[PDB]
Design a protein around this ligand. Sequence first.
Ligand SMILES: OC[C@H]1C[C@@H](O)CCN1CCc1ccc(Nc2nc(-c3ccc(Cl)c(Cl)c3)cs2)cc1
Length: 360
Amino acid sequence: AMGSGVLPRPCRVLVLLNPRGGKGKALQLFRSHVQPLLAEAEISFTLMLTERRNHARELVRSEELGRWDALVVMSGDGLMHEVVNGLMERPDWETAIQKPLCSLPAGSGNALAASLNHYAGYEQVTNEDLLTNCTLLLCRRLLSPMNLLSLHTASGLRLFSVLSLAWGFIADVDLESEKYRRLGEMRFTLGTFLRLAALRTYRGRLAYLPVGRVGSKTPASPVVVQQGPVDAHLVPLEEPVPSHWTVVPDEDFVLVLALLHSHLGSEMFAAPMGRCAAGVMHLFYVRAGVSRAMLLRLFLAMEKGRHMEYECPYLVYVPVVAFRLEPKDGKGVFAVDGELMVSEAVQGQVHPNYFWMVSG
Ligand SMILES: OC[C@H]1C[C@@H](O)CCN1CCc1ccc(Nc2nc(-c3ccc(Cl)c(Cl)c3)cs2)cc1
């Protein structure tokens, strides 16, 4: 990528590490693959161990951020999700979210690191090599602003997303592949092959606001947020979507994905059509009708990012600034930056260049 900022030399960083991540070898990996590189780059660090849910969220929320030049997060998409939400929960959120962030991959669920590795111009590497590369980026100190997804649930919960909101097949596999945690990145492949054999479809309603249809006018009364940025494009979930949105006629899906970056994983190049503009995200969905065969061919084609070449008539892609997803019947299972979330309805909008990350 091209840098829009740079960390000072020397600099001190807070390393937030999950010792349970990377099959319980994250600390070992930091010492061998990260620490010696930081010493040569004149980067001071202090390690904080976080192995409980909301723990790093609690820390970042209470932390004196002035001490640090950057916060490096070493676990995966889950922990970066925690840190960012921790920052956004703060009363001083607007300056707090400007604290540069760094993603260092540990084990599985490292799509954000994979994407940054790609922007930098590196080959699609995994595990040891990815960690080295992501550290090399941090050592080269270059910064870039990143889009942020604001989400609202049917219970009124307001959360943020750095990477993705999945629903259907993808979200189901995310959850069910947890009992294959020890297998590494390949658990998504095995989970996919299993769910493919026992294939199911998902009834629900999708609406989105595409880039070209954002006018000068905003809905009269939007969602009133307690704290944080105002989501101007969104209306309350009890209200129907504004008339300029595209309501998807189809209501039978195999998957729906809102994605802010290039990769869904270290070996899943989901978005080869190019990096999103400021305040825009990718939106994919697959309609019921695809065969098990084609679904698999798409999944395997993702490795080298060649899935869009099939021109499958059940796969639709649109760049959007906002979306609403209302699963039919009961509550739906969602993946938010890898993490499980269950809700009756979810909607969100994109906030442009809202936080900074180290990148190439
Ligand atoms: O929740 C999304 C990400 C979050 C990360 O932190 C962890 C990994 N997770 C995605 C994992 C995953 C990715 C893909 C699948 N399965 C399949 N995905 C596809 C597929 C086909 C076409 C497209 Cl355009 C896409 Cl995006 C997916 C077909 S089968 C199952 C699991």
